[PDB]
């Protein structure tokens, strides 16, 4: 399930080759997991604690920090891997005609494999990060399901 590509995937905080007294069983083969509290009142989920995925851009198990703006949006498409596009619908005001117009500005955010219970239409919130790609700047902090989907 893991180690797909031409290089080893590891978390460069822990040491995965500690020498035990025996190197047998009963205390070994449970590797430690690196995680941190991202702050701003957000709570880390269990999937980032007991998971086995390896990332370098995950807000929980990764080398990226959260600072700046906190936004929200609705998930539109899940086609490209490990990152999704959300839609922000907002209203614009004109001084001349005292009437509003709705506008949308879709943009790409990053989805770690910690949140894999995501379908089209789920409301997510994002936080500003350093540029992780050409057009990707935001990391998803939590996921909220839409109406229905009771299964």
């Amino acid at each position: 399930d893991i180690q797909t590509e031409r290089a080893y995937q590891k978390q460069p905080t822990i040491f995965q080759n500690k020498k035990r007294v025996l190197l047998g069983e009963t205390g070994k083969e449970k590797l430690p997991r690196y995680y941190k509290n991202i702050g701003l009142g957000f709570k880390t989920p269990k999937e980032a604690i007991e998971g086995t995925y390896i990332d370098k851009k995950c807000p929980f198990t990764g080398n990226v920090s959260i600072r700046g703006r906190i936004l929200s949006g609705v998930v539109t498409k899940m086609k490209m891997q490990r990152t999704i596009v959300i839609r922000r619908d907002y209203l614009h005001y004109i001084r001349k005609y005292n009437r509003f117009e709705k506008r949308h500005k879709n943009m790409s955010v990053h989805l770690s494999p910690c949140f894999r219970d995501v379908q089209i239409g789920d409301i997510v919130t994002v936080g500003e990060c350093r540029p992780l790609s050409k057009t990707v700047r935001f990391n998803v902090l939590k996921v909220t399901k839409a109406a229905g989907t009771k299964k």
Binding site: G39, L40, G41, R67
Partner: protein, 262 residues
């Protein structure tokens, strides 16, 4: 611009530099120092507009390098030296000292002080650092790196330093019930007591300050200077004690002074 700017236009100057328009094209850009450009005051501006000791830009230079003016116990020979909040300035020969405190409006004010009060200076700690061989460090709001401080000095406290030895004598803790004043913004020079301190994670932590007569206002965390422990101030406050008289009471006071003067 391929490099740093070296000129400064007259109408691009800050308003608290308190200049005129139809005098010259340029304004005195201060040399880099402890204080920022928009929050300091050049020595030429003070000596040529406030104290009226000099009239031109050469007389200020003659007085400045004549070794007559001492800045926080050190003689300075730069005519555009940045002087900011509670910069103790001394004239040794005529025996006068001035303390720079913001008055009831948004500006500086001349304030003659006794020499016994001119020996020390209240200043605000900015951040706490740890040195090379486990030495704690303090960074002060006028960039005074002090080695080995008191263990009870926190991030937003105020320390009192003797100008002859550079060490800490006494301190004020950041807590509600202490006399405070604001340095910057719409509020400036008002003296009040801290009551509330609202914590916002990831942004500016606003506080609430009540005046001694019944007025209240809210400023940011960076716009805080603690000056007293309770009601008694540790320094000599200027005239009016920083009460921020409104325009009606100011008009009434000016009319009363005009009627009494005749």
């Amino acid at each position: 611009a391929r490099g740093p700017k070296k000129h400064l236009k007259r109408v691009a100057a800050p308003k608290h530099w308190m200049l005129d328009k139809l005098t010259g094209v340029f304004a005195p850009r201060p040399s880099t120092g402890p204080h920022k450009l928009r929050e300091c005051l050049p020595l030429i501006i003070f000596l040529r507009n406030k104290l009226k000791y000099a009239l031109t830009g050469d007389e200020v230079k003659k007085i400045c390098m004549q070794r007559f003016i001492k800045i926080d116990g050190k003689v300075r020979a730069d005519i555009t030296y940045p002087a900011g909040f509670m910069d103790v300035i001394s004239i040794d020969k005529t025996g006068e000292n001035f303390r720079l405190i913001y008055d009831t409006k948004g500006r500086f004010a001349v304030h003659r002080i006794t020499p016994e009060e001119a020996k020390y200076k209240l200043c605000k700690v900015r951040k706490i650092f740890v040195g090379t061989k486990g030495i704690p460090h303090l960074v002060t709001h006028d960039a005074r790196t002090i080695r080995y401080p008191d263990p009870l000095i926190k991030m937003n406290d105020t320390i009192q330093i003797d100008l002859e030895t550079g060490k800490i004598t006494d301190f004020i803790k950041f807590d509600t019930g202490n006399l405070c004043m604001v340095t910057g913004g719409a509020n400036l020079g008002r003296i009040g007591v801290i009551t509330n301190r609202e914590r916002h994670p990831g942004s500016f932590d606003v506080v609430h300050v009540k005046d001694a007569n019944g007025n209240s206002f809210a400023t940011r965390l960076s716009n805080i200077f603690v000056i007293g422990k309770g009601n008694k101030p540790w320094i000599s406050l200027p005239r009016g004690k920083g009460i921020r008289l409104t325009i009606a009471e100011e008009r009434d006071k000016r009319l009363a002074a005009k009627q009494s003067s005749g």
